[PDB]
Design a protein around this ligand. Structure first.
Ligand SMILES: Nc1ncnc2c1ncn2[C@@H]1O[C@H](COP(=O)(O)OP(=O)(O)NP(=O)(O)O)[C@@H](O)[C@H]1O
Ligand SMILES: Nc1ncnc2c1ncn2[C@@H]1O[C@H](COP(=O)(O)OP(=O)(O)NP(=O)(O)O)[C@@H](O)[C@H]1O
Ligand code: SF4
Ligand SMILES: [Mg+2]
Ligand SMILES: [Mg+2]
Ligand code: NA
Ligand code: NA
Ligand code: NA
Lengths: 259, 268
């Protein structure tokens, strides 16, 4: 039996085909979100990768910012619910989930059943989201996928004074003009993001286990900086960007059984 | 006697030479601010215009973000004080001053003596400042100096949902690709700034007369949107970007008069 989960976010589309509600047999991420062909391309690839087709998929659930714009799913479900479900599937005793995506940062507090108890989100400021990193990566002319590894080489982190993405961009341009080492600039960029999200997490009250998800959690430098700022161990799935899609796939499995 | 005021902000350098504390005989704005050659260029132009030299200026006061980086002044004075002094010299009965500059927006409430009663500033965020406008002007490919006139033609302003400069830029890009009328895009951009600064004004409590200063006050579209959002008439000086430098020049005059009053001049 197979179900599918689709998470169409501001920035990327993620898909998972789940086997018997327990085994991920295919996952795919396309860095095109709401308002693009990203969803279609994710599907194409999940199908090519598995050999399956739409007919073989008993239930599909879509989540994320673009979920109501998608008309080919059995249910459209909140990404708060889907990320919580996906994380709880992988990591026991999760009480705090930090989802840093392309346009917002979400912090979920869960009870002992995995149900939402409290929630705080920054969705109004590009700083402390993936958008900040995307902007900086473009200026430094490296892929966001390299920022973690680059920051590892830092021995003399540059401080970024500005908390605003726009003002920070100017600072980074100025550091680049002063021939600051790219690894130190990037380390400072990671610290800026971690300070802004950490403030968010501290307002809700850290409770272990603390789990980071979202595409930004693929950046090892951000995760390290975050664990430093919140002074708590952070657990990151090997598939942090796909937890919403996985959670959708699990709700899809619930639907398929109910049928 | 002549005195000089320099206002070295984040974005532009402004200078005024004032004669006998009453007549502006020269002014100059260069769109390079702190950390640049802006200040030296301002000086060159004031001196060129007037045919004066440093030795002819009795007192110099510097203000603005860059004031402490400047070492050739007699005093370095707060830009809150300098804008208030400059505005009060030009516009009687002023009680609210809105200074929208290149990196922050300041709202000053003054008492009946021109002294600061209350103050709010948005300073950490590019939105609601000249930076926001400079960013948008670049994207829509018009000069910031044309925004005011363009916006006059708007009849159905576009919506900008985002309050963040970065997210708003993406909306403006989308509007341009959707072929929305430029004047309606510009009106929406103005409304974004005005909503953000008007929230500060409303928090402090609007009190007439309300005066707008700073380089952004040269944008008539921002002035109109602000007056709309605060539901109050706004007065703009003829030289809104220069009120800080004027205030500095007036404090410089005060210094000069203080020096004169501490001696006696005896002749027969
Ligand atoms: N390989 C990578 N390494 C590090 N960071 C990455 C990588 N790929 C993407 N990112 C970051 O991940 C972000 C997108 O994460 P993602 O969780 O897919 O956002 P989204 O769900 O589309 N947006 P939202 O609506 O905010 O949830 C981008 O903005 C990048 O900064
Ligand atoms: N001719 C013009 N028409 C409309 N707007 C203008 C014009 N010239 C400059 N501006 C705006 O005015 C700005 C700078 O204003 P100004 O008050 O000189 O800032 P500043 O004092 O250097 N910075 P701050 O440190 O924040 O006070 C730019 O960011 C522009 O948006
Ligand atoms: S601080 Fe900068 S990044 Fe944050 S909302 Fe303001 S303009 Fe956007
Ligand atoms: Mg997401
Ligand atoms: Mg100023
Ligand atoms: Na992943
Ligand atoms: Na200017
Ligand atoms: Na002016």
């Amino acid at each position: 039996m197979y179900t599918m989960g689709l998470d169409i976010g501001s920035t990327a589309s993620k898909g998972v085909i789940l086997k018997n509600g327990e085994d991920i047999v295919a996952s795919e991420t396309i860095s095109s979100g709401t308002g693009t062909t990203g969803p279609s391309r994710v599907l194409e690839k999940l199908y090519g990768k598995t050999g399956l087709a739409r007919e073989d998929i008993k239930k599909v659930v879509v989540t994320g910012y673009g979920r109501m714009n998608y008309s080919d799913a059995d249910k459209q479900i909140s990404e708060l619910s889907c990320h919580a479900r996906g994380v709880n599937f992988i990591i026991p005793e999760t009480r705090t989930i930090i989802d840093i995506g392309g346009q917002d940062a979400k912090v979920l507090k869960l009870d002992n059943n995995g149900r939402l108890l409290n929630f705080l989100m920054n969705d109004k400021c590009a700083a402390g989201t993936g958008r900040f990193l995307d902007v900086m990566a473009k200026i430094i002319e490296v892929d966001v996928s390299e920022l973690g590894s680059i920051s590892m080489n830092s021995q003399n982190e540059v401080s970024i004074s500005s908390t605003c993405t726009v003002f920070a961009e100017s600072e980074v341009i100025s550091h680049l003009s002063e021939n600051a080492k790219i690894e130190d600039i990037v380390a400072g960029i990671h610290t800026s993001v971690a300070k802004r999200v950490s403030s968010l997490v501290k307002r809700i009250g850290v409770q272990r286990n603390v789990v980071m998800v979202g595409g930004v959690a693929r950046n090892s430098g951000i995760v390290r900086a975050m664990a430093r700022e919140i002074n708590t161990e952070i657990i990151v799935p090997d598939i942090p960007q796909l937890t919403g899609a996985l959670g959708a796939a699990l709700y899809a499995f619930d639907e398929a059984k109910e049928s």
